[PDB]
Structure 1
Amino acid sequence: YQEPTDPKFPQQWYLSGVTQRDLNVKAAWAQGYTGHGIVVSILDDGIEKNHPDLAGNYDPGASFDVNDQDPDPQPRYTQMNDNRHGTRCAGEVAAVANNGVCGVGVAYNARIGGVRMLDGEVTDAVEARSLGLNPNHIHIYSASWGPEDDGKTVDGPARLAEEAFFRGVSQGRGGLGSIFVWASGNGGREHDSCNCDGYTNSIYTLSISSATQFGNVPWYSEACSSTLATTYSSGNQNEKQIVTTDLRQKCTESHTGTSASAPLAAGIIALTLEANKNLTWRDMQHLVVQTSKPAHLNANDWATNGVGRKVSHSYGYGLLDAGAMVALAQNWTTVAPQRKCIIDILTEPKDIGKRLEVRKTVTACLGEPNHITRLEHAQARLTLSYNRRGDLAIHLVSPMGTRSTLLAARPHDYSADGFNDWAFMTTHSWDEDPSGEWVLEIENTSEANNYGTLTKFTLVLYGTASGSLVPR
């Protein structure tokens, strides 16, 4: 195997490193996996399809302009180069290799397109038409953005966009399911808590956070239980950043944020899908859980779950490992059909006050076709009132003792609107048996005499009843 000769490949430290602080992509390339036959679309502000490092891989069938309602996602050029982000992300996935220009994509033989959908008013219809673009041609969608990262918003896909997610994972990709890769957010300095973003909090999105070059949690990171894994991105000014294609046929070394991590993940997922084109959308999440690596990622919340895997709310299961992903994909056995066990927990509304604990012992649909002994995602779907939402912290403890933070205190969130059947999701109990006692904790983290009521708590378990591995 001959590594790429591109002039900035040496600066792509998260791919070209020799110090074990990288995504282990060369190992996948040397196994023969470069993205050939895979199609990725960037949902963003457009794609410079004539960029010298993108044109060779550009796929019009992976592209559309929802903002102007035409097929051509070319960005709108402005003095401030506002609409450059999609071009930066596209190069991370699939910049051409060995062509003397900039660097390379993770999946440098994949085909790449873009949906121009952020340069205009983003409505539910715009979102749905983007998520549902050509779902039997595009394999993987990469989205780096969501509701405002102001630390006070709770929002997610409205009806058309949620229907697009369920159509995508159900009928997309020949019934194997569209793979939606999502950035978990850039709201760290606002103390944002990313389960309040219904796109990344979805079970249908494969959610990705960031690590700095020196292995730390970047200033912009949001912690939450819905994140699955991590890729490298930017940090402080002594740490390197992401090197990729830029608007006006240029090359940048200063692409940043969690919004630069999701495209790298999408590229790794493209390599993995080349290694086994029959992987379902759920198979892909299982591969990420099993192969991601905590080592050398610094956080104070690493905890071992019930099946022996280390998990963090900043990093999920750790750093994506492309070589390990493609190796495990090759002989992967398709997971069993997804079961869903619905448990209505409360017998009466519960005053929250300063603190509320709800304990319930469940059988996880014992005796029924939705019996789950092997969890995937779990949700606590909560309906509650409270006078100042951001003073709440919410935790969910599984029968195996795994504490998932569903919500951390958000100081800027002054809302009096509470949560209206909000489906807080955790990945941290993946592969655990969910039978037994679950504990929900709701706490007022402020000294204020805050007040409200929990009126509904639905525990929703997804998973299967076969195929478990010995714990790690």
Structure 2
Amino acid sequence: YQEPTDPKFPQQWYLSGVTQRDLNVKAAWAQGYTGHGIVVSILDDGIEKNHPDLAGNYDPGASFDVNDQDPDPQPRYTQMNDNRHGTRCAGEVAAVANNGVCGVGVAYNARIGGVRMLDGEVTDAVEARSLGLNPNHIHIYSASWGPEDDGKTVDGPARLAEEAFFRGVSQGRGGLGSIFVWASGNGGREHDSCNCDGYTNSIYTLSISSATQFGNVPWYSEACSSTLATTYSSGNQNEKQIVTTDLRQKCTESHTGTSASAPLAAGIIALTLEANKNLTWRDMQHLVVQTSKPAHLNANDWATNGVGRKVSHSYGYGLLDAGAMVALAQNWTTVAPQRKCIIDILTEPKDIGKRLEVRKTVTACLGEPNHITRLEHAQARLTLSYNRRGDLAIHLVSPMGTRSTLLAARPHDYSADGFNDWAFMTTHSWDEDPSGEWVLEIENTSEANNYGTLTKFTLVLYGTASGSLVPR
């Protein structure tokens, strides 16, 4: 193997670097993994399928136009170039290599398609038809849309889209499950808290945040416990950005935001699936947890969980490491079937007032087929009223002592509508034993005399009862 000769490959610092500030993709390419045989689709504003750096890898079977209801996802050209974003993301995954044009994709021999679905009214049905496109042909989906990143919205998939996620992970990809890679949001300037976005907060999406070139949390990032890992993206004007294919058969050096991080993750996942095509949607999340790297990502909330892994709400388990992903994938043993242990916590409603703590010792379905000794995702499904939602901060502590922030204060969230069975999700207790005392903390972070009631707290544990590693 020889490294790519493309003219902008040297500018793709997050791949081509030799300073240890990269995604370690060359190490995967040198193991022989470039994405051959894998199919990725960008769910966004279309794909310029005739782009000189995409045409060679373009896959009509990975593509559709849901906005206009036809097979051709070609973007709508406008003076502002509004519909350029899906083309930028497609090239991050699978721009052609060694062809004298722009740079390369992470998985530069993968097949790449796009769904034109953001350029029109985006209904639940539009979302569902995109998520459910050709699920026995497309392996990996990449998306960065969801509720407005204004820091005051709480919303997620409606019924058709939620059904598309469950059909994808259950029957997609021959029963191994569609891999939905998702960006955690761009609401950092609005102090948004991304578990309020039900798309990234889902267990069925493999959620990704961003780091700047110098290893910092970018201005646009949202922190939340549902995030799994990180890839590089843009930062300040002294830091480089993402280099990729652009609309009108051009090359950009200024692709930005968390929406540029999810496609890079999708490309790394494509390399990993080439290394072991039998990996399930859950296997893939395990690989990410085990291989991602905190090193040189700066945050003030790095904490060690109960199995010795460092986790952050900005970064999840850290920067994706492509070489480590493909290495660990090769001999990976498929995880056991997913168990689900439902624990209804409250015996009566609880006044919140200034601060509420709910403590409960659980057996995690001891003696039952859904007994869980090895956690994957955990959810605190909460139903509560409160007079100003954004003054609330919510934490969940596992028996092993891992404090997950379920909700941070959102100063713009003035809503009086509370949370209606909202399934706040944390990845930070992955591989812990969930037996023992869990603690839920709800606090009013303002000096205001706020008021409300918690009426339901369901602790939902997912996981297995076998296969643990020694703690890190």
Q: Deviations over 1:313-367 (max 9, x none)?
A: 0000000000000000000000000000000000000000000000000000000
SS at match of 1:285: helix
Q: d(CA) in 2 for partners of 1:246 and 1:185?
A: 22
Identical aligned pairs, as a percentage?
Answer: 100
SS at match of 1:90: helix
1:149 aligns with 2:141: no
Q: d(CA) in 2 for partners of 1:454 and 1:69?
A: 45
Q: Deviations over 1:178-205 (max 9, x none)?
A: 0000000000000000000000000000
SS at match of 1:85: helix
SS at match of 1:371: coil
SS at match of 1:172: helix
SS at match of 1:454: strand
Q: How far did residue 257 of structure 1 move?
A: 0.3
Q: d(CA) in 2 for partners of 1:222 and 1:170?
A: 29
Q: d(CA) in 1 for partners of 2:446 and 2:130?
A: 41
Q: Deviations over 1:233-258 (max 9, x none)?
A: 00000000000000000000000000
Q: 2:449: which partner in 1?
A: 449
Q: Deviations over 1:375-395 (max 9, x none)?
A: 000000000000000000000
Q: Deviations over 1:54-110 (max 9, x none)?
A: 000000000000000000000000000000000000000000000000000000000
- Aligned-residue CA RMSD (Å): 0.3
Q: How far did residue 144 of structure 1 move?
A: 1.4
Q: How far did residue 32 of structure 1 move?
A: 0.1
Q: d(CA) in 2 for partners of 1:310 and 1:405?
A: 15
Q: d(CA) in 2 for partners of 1:387 and 1:57?
A: 53
Q: Deviations over 1:206-252 (max 9, x none)?
A: 00000000000000000000000000000000000000000000000
Q: d(CA) in 1 for partners of 2:401 and 2:395?
A: 12
SS at match of 2:326: helix
Q: d(CA) in 2 for partners of 1:453 and 1:75?
A: 48
SS at match of 1:423: strand
Q: d(CA) in 2 for partners of 1:142 and 1:366?
A: 38
Q: 2:138: which partner in 1?
A: 138
Q: d(CA) in 2 for partners of 1:360 and 1:92?
A: 46
Q: 1:113: which partner in 2?
A: 113
Q: 2:406: which partner in 1?
A: 406
Q: 1:17: which partner in 2?
A: 17
Q: d(CA) in 1 for partners of 2:153 and 2:100?
A: 44
Q: How far did residue 125 of structure 1 move?
A: 0.2
Q: How far did residue 145 of structure 1 move?
A: 1.7
Q: d(CA) in 2 for partners of 1:337 and 1:255?
A: 39
Q: d(CA) in 2 for partners of 1:9 and 1:145?
A: 28
Q: How does 1:374-389 map to 2 (within 5 A)?
A: 374-389=374-389
Q: How far did residue 283 of structure 1 move?
A: 0.0
Q: d(CA) in 2 for partners of 1:246 and 1:228?
A: 28
SS at match of 2:97: coil
Q: Deviations over 1:143-188 (max 9, x none)?
A: 0121110000000000000000000000000000000000000000
SS at match of 2:300: coil
Q: 2:71: which partner in 1?
A: 71
Q: d(CA) in 1 for partners of 2:130 and 2:452?
A: 38
Unaligned runs of 5+ in 1: none
Q: Deviations over 1:393-445 (max 9, x none)?
A: 00000000000000000000000000000000000000000000000000000
Q: d(CA) in 2 for partners of 1:32 and 1:423?
A: 41
Q: d(CA) in 1 for partners of 2:144 and 2:326?
A: 24
Q: Deviations over 1:12-44 (max 9, x none)?
A: 000000000000000000000000000000000
Q: d(CA) in 2 for partners of 1:113 and 1:241?
A: 23
Q: How far did residue 48 of structure 1 move?
A: 0.3
Q: d(CA) in 2 for partners of 1:307 and 1:363?
A: 19
Q: d(CA) in 2 for partners of 1:410 and 1:81?
A: 33
Q: d(CA) in 2 for partners of 1:36 and 1:326?
A: 13
Q: d(CA) in 2 for partners of 1:149 and 1:466?
A: 39
For normalisation by structure 1, the TM-score amounts to 1.00
SS at match of 1:254: strand
Q: d(CA) in 2 for partners of 1:153 and 1:249?
A: 37
Q: d(CA) in 1 for partners of 2:247 and 2:447?
A: 49
Q: d(CA) in 1 for partners of 2:177 and 2:85?
A: 26
Q: d(CA) in 1 for partners of 2:282 and 2:468?
A: 15
Q: d(CA) in 2 for partners of 1:149 and 1:104?
A: 30
Unaligned runs of 5+ in 2: none
1:340 aligns with 2:343: no
Q: How does 1:35-54 map to 2 (within 5 A)?
A: 35-54=35-54
1:427 aligns with 2:427: yes
Q: d(CA) in 2 for partners of 1:118 and 1:89?
A: 14
Q: d(CA) in 2 for partners of 1:441 and 1:72?
A: 50
Q: How far did residue 52 of structure 1 move?
A: 0.3
Runs of 4 or more off by more than 3 Å in structure 1? none
Q: d(CA) in 2 for partners of 1:421 and 1:122?
A: 24
Q: d(CA) in 1 for partners of 2:35 and 2:153?
A: 37
SS at match of 1:28: helix
Q: How far did residue 303 of structure 1 move?
A: 0.1
Q: d(CA) in 2 for partners of 1:144 and 1:198?
A: 12
SS at match of 2:93: helix
Q: d(CA) in 2 for partners of 1:85 and 1:129?
A: 20
Q: Deviations over 1:267-313 (max 9, x none)?
A: 00000000000000000000000000000000000000000000000
Q: How does 1:198-213 map to 2 (within 5 A)?
A: 198-213=198-213
SS at match of 2:262: helix
Q: 1:328: which partner in 2?
A: 328
Q: d(CA) in 2 for partners of 1:36 and 1:267?
A: 11
For normalisation by structure 2, the TM-score amounts to 1.00
